[PDB]
Swiss-Prot record:
Originating gene: flhA
Protein name as catalogued: Flagellar biosynthesis protein FlhA
Function as written in the Swiss-Prot or TrEMBL entry: Required for formation of the rod structure of the flagellar apparatus. Together with FliI and FliH, may constitute the export apparatus of flagellin.
Subcellular location: Cell inner membrane
Entry similarity comment: Belongs to the FHIPEP (flagella/HR/invasion proteins export pore) family.
Lineage: Bacteria, Pseudomonadati, Pseudomonadota, Gammaproteobacteria, Enterobacterales
Length: 333
């Protein structure tokens, strides 16, 4: 057995972690976990911190179930100057790399702080660096961190709000195993699970006749359509998405039923042009959203996100029919 979420730390990062001392990282973690619970819909597990004298004074390792998923530096008396893309010149110091987004970074002394801000850098203290890293890792592994016990804790906490919904569904109609796999499927594709009533209502309707967690994932995502549409396109602005070629769509649809399919070279064209469309979206300031026909969403999501996990494959039945959609990137032959 192992801690589902841990952090080993060298002796200079003990202060920010020690409650008796300043404990500044303690409060940043507590705020990360509560912002995460009200955004993504489940409270991430407590981070068990311990000291490891095998670690260099200023190094830390963020672990999950005993497996290292992160590591980096943090110097208590110094600051991390980050190039957000626009910064100019450089600064004396250790020229490392941002732990979360990989941006270029310099560890400057405290007296060079205003120098960095004038040169366009973003300056943060050491605890802010560890907290940013851990926050980015919790989001990336939110599905893996949502374990079976976390589903039970979520079910208990929710049974107070919707008692008729939870006892008459789990485990008589939907087992904790099936409900956990479904919620995990949503989290793996960055769909929030705040709206447990909609989720549980939906599973209550379909799970009698449909026990496969993947088929139930599709009908729950549709039920969460407004939450999905609003997360990537907040407000009333224009919905800028990747779509694929009309012919390609029908040709992809033929291959799934009778007819088809496409040459394996075109399957690799499909992958390369998705990478081209992806890079075009961030150039346009658009979101990395590929919008396809419902019968193609589960297929393209598994097929593309295997190598392009940053991609978000939404479905036409999930996108709110009241918003204006412009295809701003294509996927052809
Ligand atoms: Ca409703
Ligand atoms: Ca729709």
């Amino acid at each position: 057995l192992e801690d589902s979420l841990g952090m080993e730390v060298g002796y200079r990062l003990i202060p920010m972690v020690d409650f008796q001392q300043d404990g500044e990282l303690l409060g940043r973690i507590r705020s990360i976990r509560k912002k995460f619970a009200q955004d993504m819909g489940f409270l991430p597990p407590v981070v068990h911190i311990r000291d490891n004298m095998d670690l260099q004074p200023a190094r830390y390792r963020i672990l999950m179930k005993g497996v290292e998923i992160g590591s980096g530096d943090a110097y208590p008396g110094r600051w991390l100057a980050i190039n957000p893309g626009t910064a100019a010149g450089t600064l004396p110091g250790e020229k490392t790399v941002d732990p979360a987004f990989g941006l270029d970074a310099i560890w400057i002394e405290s007296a060079l702080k205003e120098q960095a801000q004038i040169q366009g850098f973003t300056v943060v203290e050491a605890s802010t660096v560890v907290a940013t890293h851990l926050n980015h890792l919790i989001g990336q592994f939110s599905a893996e961190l949502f374990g079976r016990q976390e589903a039970q804790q979520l079910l208990d906490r929710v049974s107070q709000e919707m008692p008729k919904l939870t006892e008459d569904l789990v485990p008589g109609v939907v087992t904790l195993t099936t409900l956990h796999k479904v919620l995990q499927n949503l989290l793996a594709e960055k769909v929030p699970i705040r709206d447990m009533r909609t989720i549980l209502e939906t599973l209550a309707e379909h799970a009698p006749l449909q026990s496969d967690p993947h088929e139930l994932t599709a009908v729950v995502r549709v039920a969460l359509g407004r939450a999905i549409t609003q997360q990537w396109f907040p407000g009333n602005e224009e919905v800028q998405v990747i779509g694929l070629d009309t012919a390609l769509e029908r040709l992809l649809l033929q291959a799934l039923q009778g007819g088809g399919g496409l040459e394996p070279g075109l399957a690799d064209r499909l992958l390369a042009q998705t990478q081209e469309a992806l890079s075009r979206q961030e150039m346009l300031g658009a979101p990395p959203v590929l919008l396809v026909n419902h019968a193609l969403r589960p297929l393209l999501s598994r097929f593309l996100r295997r190598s392009l996990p940053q991609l978000v494959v939404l479905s036409n039945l999930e996108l709110s029919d009241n918003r204006h959609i412009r295809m701003t990137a294509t996927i052809g032959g």
